[PDB]
């Protein structure tokens, strides 16, 4: 469906600029991507498409049982003709009767955990790479959806079942996100095996100013270039910072490690918080 | 439809308004109809055309004299 209106220019329902440096880009359409993947059965990949709304690539899959077509985030290496399947609604009877038992983590992971398959995080073994990690049991994928991103399964709340078979006891699983944060994720959370496509996205270069304008990005004016009435950094004869600690146009510290997360909003899913670089030079 | 010129309510005084428009209709007849020709100025005496022509001339001169004055001029 088309992406049009004053929202493309950074305006909200009042008509005022709420997101700066937006507008004038190329005419786009939004692609309806399926981040839930509830329908079971095999799905045949028809092609990998470019999507201007996201950095990663999308795959047009077709349901062999129904014929309905859908869009999903393509994995690194996924090409046309491949067959993906979602085991979120449950395991198929063909996989259950064969193994006989209700669940066999051994052969299960060897028959379902393939690139582009959507499985509950509980069913994915430790150390596996995933790129559509969900948070809630019945929620969509929210983490590591961007290009070249992937999460790692660190641990699972489980115990052994008298024959070296691990069985889930708790309600959550631990995953390492792209930012390096090891947090807690539901047991029935969404997860797609593989890595998000377009791994070389962050190596591109636009080359000229006009290319950034085509992508709906408008010029960014520095605070030093403004007047005292317009910015805390404005004013001064010549180039002058004014002995003013870096801040946003509204007083928010722009450097030094000031966290903008609300203090009352404590994250109860975090096991190991992110590592703060603390302003040190990485290279 | 024939529109009428915008005018002031009292000619040279009052608010500006516009009279109602005039509507003319031309019907295509099944049988032709021809109008008589207007009488000649010599035969219009039943209407007192002689007196009417003198009065008309005087009115034309009066509007012409006013036009010369409206141009900011006078007759030498």
């Amino acid at each position: 469906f088309p992406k049009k209106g004053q929202s493309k220019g950074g305006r909200n329902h009042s008509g005022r600029v709420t997101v700066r440096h937006r507008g004038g880009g190329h005419k786009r359409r939004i692609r309806m991507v399926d981040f839930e993947r509830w329908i079971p059965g095999p799905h045949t990949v028809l092609r990998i498409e470019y999507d201007p709304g996201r950095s990663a690539h999308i795959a047009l899959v077709k349901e062999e049982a129904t014929g309905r077509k859908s869009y999903i985030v393509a994995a690194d290496g996924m090409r046309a003709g491949d067959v993906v399947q979602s085991y979120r609604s449950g395991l198929p009877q063909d996989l259950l009767d064969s193994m006989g038992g209700v669940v066999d983590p051994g052969i299960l992971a060897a028959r379902t955990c393939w690139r582009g398959n959507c499985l509950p995080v509980s069913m994915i073994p430790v150390g596996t790479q995933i790129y559509c990690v969900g948070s809630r049991p019945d929620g969509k994928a929210v983490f590591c959806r961007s290009a070249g991103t992937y999460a790692t399964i660190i641990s699972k709340e489980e115990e052994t079942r008298e024959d070296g078979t691990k069985v889930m006891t708790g309600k959550f699983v631990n995953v390492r996100l792209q930012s390096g944060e090891i947090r807690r994720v539901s047991k029935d959370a969404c997860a797609t095996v593989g890595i998000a496509s377009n791994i070389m996205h962050h190596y591109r270069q636009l080359g000229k100013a006009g290319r950034s304008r085509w992508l709906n990005i408008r010029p960014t004016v520095r605070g030093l270039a403004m007047n005292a009435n317009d910015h805390p950094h404005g004013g001064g004869r010549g180039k002058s910072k004014g002995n003013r600690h870096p801040v946003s146009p509204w007083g928010t510290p722009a450097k030094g490690g000031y966290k903008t997360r609300r203090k009352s909003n404590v994250n109860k899913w975090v096991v190991t918080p992110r590592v703060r670089n603390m302003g040190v030079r990485r290279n | 439809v024939n529109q009428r010129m915008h005018e002031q309510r009292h000619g040279d005084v009052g608010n500006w308004r516009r009279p109602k428009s005039q509507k003319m209709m031309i019907a295509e007849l099944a049988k032709p109809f021809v109008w008589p020709k207007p009488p000649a100025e010599d035969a219009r005496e039943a209407f007192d055309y002689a007196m009417w022509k003198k009065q008309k001339t005087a009115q034309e001169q009066d509007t012409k004299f006013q036009g010369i004055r409206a141009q900011g001029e006078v007759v030498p």
Binding site: - | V1, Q3, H6, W16, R18, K23
Partner: protein, 95 residues
């Protein structure tokens, strides 16, 4: 932008969808194709009788001087429903 703009807008002054009728009356309905279907139940006809042999004219000779009607002792002289009914029984009782 001066005195003329302050006059009332008319259809002969502008284009681009400014339609304003002249109270002629709706004689039908519009279609989705841009045409008009006339509804002859809305079309009006003029009932003119036959004037052959009619001796009345819009003028009366000035030898007959004008005279108004008299209704002594009757406030609602010409609008009296009783006089209309009483005059009906004597003249026409059937209908």
């Amino acid at each position: 932008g001066l005195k003329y703009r302050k006059l009332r807008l008319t259809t002969k002054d502008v284009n681009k969808g400014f339609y304003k009728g002249n109270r002629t009356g709706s004689m039908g309905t519009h279609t989705s194709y841009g045409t008009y279907k006339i509804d002859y139940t809305k079309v009006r006809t003029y009932v003119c009788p036959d004037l052959t042999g009619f001796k009345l004219t819009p003028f009366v000779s000035k030898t007959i001087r004008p005279v108004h009607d008299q209704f002594p002792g009757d406030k609602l002289g010409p609008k009296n429903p009783a006089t209309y009914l009483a005059r009906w029984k004597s003249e026409n009782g059937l209908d």
